[PDB]
Design a protein around this motif. Structure first.
Motif, mmCIF file in Angstrom:
data_model
loop_
_atom_site.group_PDB
_atom_site.id
_atom_site.type_symbol
_atom_site.label_atom_id
_atom_site.label_comp_id
_atom_site.label_asym_id
_atom_site.label_seq_id
_atom_site.Cartn_x
_atom_site.Cartn_y
_atom_site.Cartn_z
ATOM 1 N N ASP A 129 0.835 -1.197 0.000
ATOM 2 C CA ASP A 129 0.000 0.000 0.000
ATOM 3 C C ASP A 129 0.870 1.247 0.000
ATOM 4 O O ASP A 129 0.606 2.205 -0.733
ATOM 5 C CB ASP A 129 -0.912 0.052 1.222
ATOM 6 N N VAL A 130 1.889 1.238 0.845
ATOM 7 C CA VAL A 130 2.748 2.408 1.008
ATOM 8 C C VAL A 130 3.514 2.646 -0.317
ATOM 9 O O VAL A 130 3.700 3.794 -0.726
ATOM 10 C CB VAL A 130 3.707 2.250 2.200
ATOM 11 N N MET A 131 3.878 1.568 -1.008
ATOM 12 C CA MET A 131 4.589 1.698 -2.289
ATOM 13 C C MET A 131 3.696 2.348 -3.334
ATOM 14 O O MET A 131 4.139 3.244 -4.045
ATOM 15 C CB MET A 131 5.121 0.367 -2.798
ATOM 16 N N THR A 145 0.086 3.527 -7.994
ATOM 17 C CA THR A 145 -0.386 2.204 -8.370
ATOM 18 C C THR A 145 -0.104 1.824 -9.817
ATOM 19 O O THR A 145 0.420 0.738 -10.077
ATOM 20 C CB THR A 145 -1.882 2.104 -8.164
ATOM 21 N N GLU A 146 -0.459 2.721 -10.746
ATOM 22 C CA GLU A 146 -0.277 2.467 -12.161
ATOM 23 C C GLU A 146 1.192 2.463 -12.546
ATOM 24 O O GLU A 146 1.638 1.641 -13.330
ATOM 25 C CB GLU A 146 -1.051 3.499 -12.985
ATOM 26 N N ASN A 147 1.924 3.412 -12.006
ATOM 27 C CA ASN A 147 3.358 3.442 -12.179
ATOM 28 C C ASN A 147 4.053 2.147 -11.750
ATOM 29 O O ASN A 147 4.776 1.564 -12.539
ATOM 30 C CB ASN A 147 3.934 4.698 -11.573
ATOM 31 N N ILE A 148 3.775 1.688 -10.537
ATOM 32 C CA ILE A 148 4.279 0.398 -10.046
ATOM 33 C C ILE A 148 3.884 -0.743 -10.996
ATOM 34 O O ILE A 148 4.726 -1.586 -11.363
ATOM 35 C CB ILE A 148 3.797 0.084 -8.586
ATOM 36 N N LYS A 149 2.615 -0.777 -11.395
ATOM 37 C CA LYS A 149 2.122 -1.829 -12.288
ATOM 38 C C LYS A 149 2.796 -1.800 -13.648
ATOM 39 O O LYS A 149 3.235 -2.838 -14.166
ATOM 40 C CB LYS A 149 0.604 -1.713 -12.494
ATOM 41 N N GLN A 150 2.877 -0.620 -14.243
ATOM 42 C CA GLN A 150 3.395 -0.552 -15.602
ATOM 43 C C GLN A 150 4.905 -0.803 -15.692
ATOM 44 O O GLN A 150 5.395 -1.270 -16.722
ATOM 45 C CB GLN A 150 3.035 0.767 -16.273
ATOM 46 N N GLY A 175 6.433 -2.854 -13.776
ATOM 47 C CA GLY A 175 6.643 -4.231 -13.300
ATOM 48 C C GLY A 175 7.099 -4.330 -11.862
ATOM 49 O O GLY A 175 7.749 -5.313 -11.462
ATOM 50 N N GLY A 176 6.782 -3.320 -11.072
ATOM 51 C CA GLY A 176 7.130 -3.327 -9.659
ATOM 52 C C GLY A 176 8.119 -2.253 -9.259
ATOM 53 O O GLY A 176 8.779 -1.658 -10.103
ATOM 54 N N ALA A 177 8.209 -2.011 -7.956
ATOM 55 C CA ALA A 177 9.095 -1.001 -7.395
ATOM 56 C C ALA A 177 10.536 -1.148 -7.829
ATOM 57 O O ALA A 177 11.182 -0.158 -8.188
ATOM 58 C CB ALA A 177 9.012 -1.014 -5.892
ATOM 59 N N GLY A 213 11.778 -2.662 -10.565
ATOM 60 C CA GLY A 213 11.746 -2.271 -11.975
ATOM 61 C C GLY A 213 11.650 -0.765 -12.182
ATOM 62 O O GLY A 213 12.385 -0.188 -12.970
ATOM 63 N N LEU A 214 10.728 -0.126 -11.476
ATOM 64 C CA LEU A 214 10.596 1.342 -11.505
ATOM 65 C C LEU A 214 11.910 2.088 -11.109
ATOM 66 O O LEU A 214 12.450 2.892 -11.899
ATOM 67 C CB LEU A 214 9.440 1.734 -10.591
ATOM 68 N N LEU A 215 12.417 1.784 -9.909
ATOM 69 C CA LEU A 215 13.580 2.470 -9.311
ATOM 70 C C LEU A 215 14.930 2.247 -10.027
ATOM 71 O O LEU A 215 15.840 3.096 -9.935
ATOM 72 C CB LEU A 215 13.708 2.068 -7.848
ATOM 73 N N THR A 216 15.074 1.117 -10.725
ATOM 74 C CA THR A 216 16.327 0.823 -11.390
ATOM 75 C C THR A 216 16.208 0.996 -12.921
ATOM 76 O O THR A 216 17.085 0.528 -13.660
ATOM 77 C CB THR A 216 16.833 -0.629 -11.102
ATOM 78 N N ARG A 217 15.153 1.669 -13.398
ATOM 79 C CA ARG A 217 14.934 1.815 -14.849
ATOM 80 C C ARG A 217 15.017 0.465 -15.588
ATOM 81 O O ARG A 217 15.666 0.349 -16.640
ATOM 82 C CB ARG A 217 15.922 2.806 -15.462
ATOM 83 N N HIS A 218 14.357 -0.541 -15.014
ATOM 84 C CA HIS A 218 14.264 -1.896 -15.558
ATOM 85 C C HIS A 218 15.559 -2.687 -15.585
ATOM 86 O O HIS A 218 15.575 -3.794 -16.108
ATOM 87 C CB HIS A 218 13.681 -1.887 -16.972
ATOM 88 N N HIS A 219 16.642 -2.140 -15.037
ATOM 89 C CA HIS A 219 17.891 -2.898 -14.977
ATOM 90 C C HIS A 219 17.780 -4.112 -14.082
ATOM 91 O O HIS A 219 18.465 -5.110 -14.306
ATOM 92 C CB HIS A 219 19.069 -2.023 -14.581
ATOM 93 N N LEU A 220 16.933 -4.017 -13.057
ATOM 94 C CA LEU A 220 16.561 -5.156 -12.258
ATOM 95 C C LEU A 220 15.068 -5.180 -12.104
ATOM 96 O O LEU A 220 14.387 -4.163 -12.291
ATOM 97 C CB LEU A 220 17.171 -5.103 -10.845
ATOM 98 N N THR A 221 14.596 -6.342 -11.695
ATOM 99 C CA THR A 221 13.219 -6.597 -11.377
ATOM 100 C C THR A 221 13.212 -7.438 -10.069
ATOM 101 O O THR A 221 14.194 -8.100 -9.753
ATOM 102 C CB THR A 221 12.680 -7.337 -12.598
ATOM 103 N N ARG A 222 12.134 -7.407 -9.295
ATOM 104 C CA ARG A 222 12.051 -8.295 -8.138
ATOM 105 C C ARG A 222 12.412 -9.726 -8.555
ATOM 106 O O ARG A 222 13.256 -10.379 -7.907
ATOM 107 C CB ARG A 222 10.671 -8.239 -7.469
#
Lengths: 173, 180, 165, 172
Positions: A122-124, A130-135, A137-139, A141-150
């Protein structure tokens, strides 16, 4: 066809296990069976210790309910202070492998909200959207410009947890 | 014996791989489990003919082999959501593999990155036996295969095939860009 | 006093890719990586596999002529055939050549049509609003990770002199 | 003209890991990467998570004091706790700190016994040249499904997150 019990029914977690075993043991036939068992800890573990204990308990509880599989896998996300990570546990009948994933440092606004007893996901959504996180592929993915993913972070921790099984000579049981 | 009964497990659709080779089934399972991490499938191998040479000797024949395997898998084993064919081939001094992924309505495809083979291997040409003769049976096994051996373990056939399987899933990752 | 690698392109992404491959395969060695601009003697956008490979080969040859003395010369050229795009990698020393074509992928019909009407970059930017590979795979792959494999494969003859020459 | 990045280590493998993380996340930028030797002010072999992180924090603090003016400073310190090993990555600009601990590795008992310098023991147990050419202990134990480089790369990228996302990670 050898059985792996995953102590989660969450698709992302069962798929992470599918990918790890299908990668490390590519010549073997595998059946993947997700189950829901209690962790006996908080729904959101708040220390390294509690997070690892939750994963151990789910594996133990899975073994008790469903004995006779070749492997049992636990994967539990946790928080400690301003970091989040997950413990991977893999047990055979004789051996246990373990790895904690690489940790992510949380923004100070996220930590402020966790202090108000709020749930991390929720806090994320609040902090990133919400949409940003979803699109993205997760926090991660968002924070590392897709260089990593969970998922790619969890993949390395699962492989590390499989080390005793990859090298039985170095890890006697 | 004490596993959860099938009828109590999560319902999921099937993916048919036109191969019984565990390494091929596993490569497909790894690609789908990576690309569609919130969706789950059961991965099933089947035995069907390629109707081309056991060792395809051109890019065209390699591709036709994989297309034929998928076609034949759909005819003999209907009902799955996706069908996947994966066929290794040679052309001149290069080896590579074609990946074909079909849903009911759409086809994705990718040929893996190609590897130059040593001249002795081409000359001696079953490819597997020749690889064993030239590099050593135990050597090949211990390094994860010829690619593993030739690249000092920086790549393996499996990490090569993984990229080409992901690329073959492009039309299904982006249905709006690939009308069917 | 330090050995040179000439990349037959001034593209930063291509220079980076070459650095990464050599750093992976030969982690102990040091090289000065230098991007140069040379003619390909083919279309700005190659429209066949053969043309794409020829362009990379020509660029390596031209780089050798213009910039003699380097330990390795590297060509890296993207192209299209039918609905697919791929790139040819060519590595040459003074005595040896390695080569590999990267894994190919299907481009969107809309992209291919608008390509047939004229740059590839301009088209994707408009169509979509890590390269094309990054966009189309939702980042499960990127252009740099796909090129990295082909570059390592192109280095095989150099890694394995007993088996190649 | 060009900015400097100071790595609190002269291990070539550490410098090369940092160069690689920076090329990945900032592909359009160029730095001179410079390895330095500074004290950690902790044990030569840290034996806790806390000690490992502190050694990395200290090295970066000492690097800044001794080599002022660079754009980034990186500490990369391996350590042990119970039967695991891992590395703390600390990246600082003048204004902000990113950090991540790498995924941990369970050590073989033969190795853990011989501690009672980890690198020395790994060389002693796996062979110096095998560790160097085959991707480290990580490379040897995972049969090259992972390497030390590929594991380090992830934690370095995670450590760069605040500099990627300044709006979410304010320096004050």
């Amino acid at each position: 066809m050898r059985k792996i019990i995953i102590a989660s029914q969450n698709p992302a977690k069962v798929n992470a296990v599918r990918s790890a075993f299908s990668t490390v043991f590519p010549d073997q036939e595998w059946e993947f069976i997700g189950v829901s068992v209690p962790s006996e800890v908080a729904d959101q573990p708040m220390s390294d210790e509690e997070t690892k204990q939750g994963a151990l308990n789910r594996v133990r509880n899975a073994k008790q309910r469903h004995p006779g599989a070749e492997y049992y896998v636990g994967l539990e996300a946790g928080i400690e202070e301003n970091k989040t990570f997950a413990w991977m546990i893999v047990e055979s009948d004789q051996q246990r492998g373990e790895s904690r994933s690489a940790c992510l440092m949380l923004p100070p606004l996220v930590l402020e909200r966790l202090r108000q007893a709020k749930e991390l996901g929720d806090v994320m959504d609040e902090v990133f959207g919400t949409e940003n996180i979803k699109q993205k592929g997760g926090a991660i993915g968002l924070l590392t410009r897709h260089h990593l993913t969970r998922s790619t972070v969890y993949h390395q921790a699962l492989i590390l947890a499989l080390i005793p099984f990859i090298n039985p000579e170095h890890y006697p049981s």
